[PDB]
Scaffold this active site. Structure first.
Site, short mmCIF file in Angstrom:
data_model
loop_
_atom_site.label_atom_id
_atom_site.label_comp_id
_atom_site.label_asym_id
_atom_site.label_seq_id
_atom_site.Cartn_x
_atom_site.Cartn_y
_atom_site.Cartn_z
N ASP A 131 42.77 78.67 47.84
CA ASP A 131 42.52 77.68 48.87
C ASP A 131 42.61 76.27 48.34
OD1 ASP A 131 42.09 76.69 51.41
OD2 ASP A 131 40.07 77.43 51.56
N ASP A 149 35.40 75.43 42.69
CA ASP A 149 35.66 76.73 42.07
C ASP A 149 34.92 77.89 42.69
OD1 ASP A 149 33.45 75.67 40.86
OD2 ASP A 149 34.31 75.54 38.88
#
Ligand SMILES: Cc1cc(Nc2ncc3cc(-c4c(Cl)cccc4Cl)c(=O)n(C)c3n2)ccc1F
Length: 268
Positions: A131, A149
Site C-alpha cells: 500500500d 510499516d
C-alpha cells in the site's frame, strides 16, 4: 523479550488520522515525557493474530526511513504497538498544504530519496508493502519522511503474493498484475512507487484525474500512462515510466531507483 513493556507506561491521548490508519492514537510515554504513536485493537479492526504478527514484524525493521517500533504490550489485551511519533502527519496532506518555496525541487528529490531508501531496505529484507502511497508516508520536521510499516508481508524477493479472494485495492496505485490476478511482489511496490513519484511531483494531486476507476485497467492495457507533470524533471519522469512497465520484471529495482535519486539529490 526486550520489547515488552507495561501498558501503564503510556497515557493515551486522541485518535490520529481520522480512522484511516485504524485504531491509532497519539500518546505520552510518561517516563520520558515523549510523545509516541500507539496502535491498539479494541474495535475489531483487525484480527488478533494479524495484529500480533504486525508487532512481530515491526521488531525486525530498523531503518531511518521506516517508522521505528519502541515497544509492545502483547501479554494480555488490550494489545499495543508503540512507535515513534511523526509530528506533521501524512505526506499527501503535507504536499497539499506546504509552502512550495520551502518544499521546493530539491526537497522533492530529498523526499523521493528517503522513500526509495526505505523501499530498498524492504527489498533487501524480503518484505513487501502493498500500500505504498503518499497517504502512507509520514512526515516530521525538516522534511524527514518515513514509510509507514503497518501491513508488511514476508515474501522472498523473487516470489509472488496472492491476495485474498474478494480483496479491494486502491486502484490508482495498483499494478496491472494485482488488478487482474491479485498478484503482488516487490515489483508491484515499484509500480506504486511510480504513482507516489507522480503524487510528489504534483504536490498531492489525485492520480488519473477525472478518470473513472472502472476504466483505469483498460487504459493501462492499451498503453496509456499519466503524462509528465508540470515542472517534473525529464529524468524523474523516465524513472516513473520505468516503474510503470507492464511486465513486472522490466521495472527497476529499488536499489536502482534509490541510487538514481541519491545521485540527483547530491547534484542538485
Ligand atoms: C498529526 C498526525 C501525526 C501522525 N503521526 C503518526 N506518527 C506515527 C505513526 C505510527 C503508526 C504506526 C503504528 Cl502506531 C503502529 C504500527 C505501524 C505504524 Cl506506521 C501509524 O499508523 N501512524 C498513523 C502514525 N502516525 C499521523 C496523522 C496525523 F494527522
Amino acid at each position: 523479550d526486550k520489547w515488552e513493556m507495561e501498558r501503564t507506561d503510556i497515557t493515551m491521548k486522541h485518535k490520529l488520522g481520522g480512522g484511516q490508519y485504524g485504531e491509532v492514537y497519539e500518546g505520552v510515554w510518561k517516563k520520558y515525557s515523549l510523545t509516541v504513536a500507539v496502535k491498539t485493537l479494541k474495535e475489531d479492526t483487525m484480527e488478533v493474530e494479524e495484529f500480533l504478527k504486525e508487532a512481530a514484524v515491526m521488531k525486525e525493521i530498523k531503518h531511518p526511513n521506516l517508522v521505528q517500533l519502541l515497544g509492545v504490550c502483547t501479554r494480555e489485551p488490550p494489545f499495543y504497538i508503540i512507535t515513534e511519533f511523526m509530528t506533521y502527519g501524512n505526506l499527501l496532506d503535507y504536499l497539499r498544504e506546504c509552502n512550495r518555496q520551502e518544499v521546493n525541487a530539491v526537497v522533492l528529490l530529498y523526499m523521493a530519496t528517503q522513500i526509495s531508501s526505505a523501499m530498498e531496505y524492504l527489498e533487501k529484507k524480503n518484505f513487501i508493502h502493498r500500500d505504498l502511497a503518499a497517504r502512507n508516508c509520514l512526515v516530521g520536521e525538516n522534511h524527514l519522511v518515513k514509510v509507514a510499516d503497518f501491513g508488511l508481508s514476508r515474501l522472498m524477493t523473487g516470489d509472488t503474493y496472492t491476495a485474498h479472494a474478494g480483496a479491494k485495492f486502491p486502484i490508482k496505485w495498483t499494478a496491472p498484475e494485482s488488478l487482474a490476478y491479485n498478484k503482488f511482489s516487490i515489483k508491484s511496490d515499484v509500480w506504486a512507487f511510480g504513482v507516489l513519484l507522480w503524487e510528489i511531483a504534483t504536490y498531492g494531486m489525485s492520480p488519473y484525474p477525472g478518470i473513472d476507476l472502472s476504466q483505469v485497467y483498460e487504459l493501462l492495457e492499451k498503453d496509456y500512462r499519466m503524462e509528465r507533470p508540470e515542472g517534473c524533471p525529464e529524468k524523474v519522469y523516465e524513472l516513473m515510466r520505468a516503474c510503470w512497465q507492464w511486465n513486472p520484471s522490466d521495472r527497476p529495482s529499488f536499489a536502482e531507483i534509490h541510487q538514481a535519486f541519491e545521485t540527483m539529490f547530491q547534484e542538485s
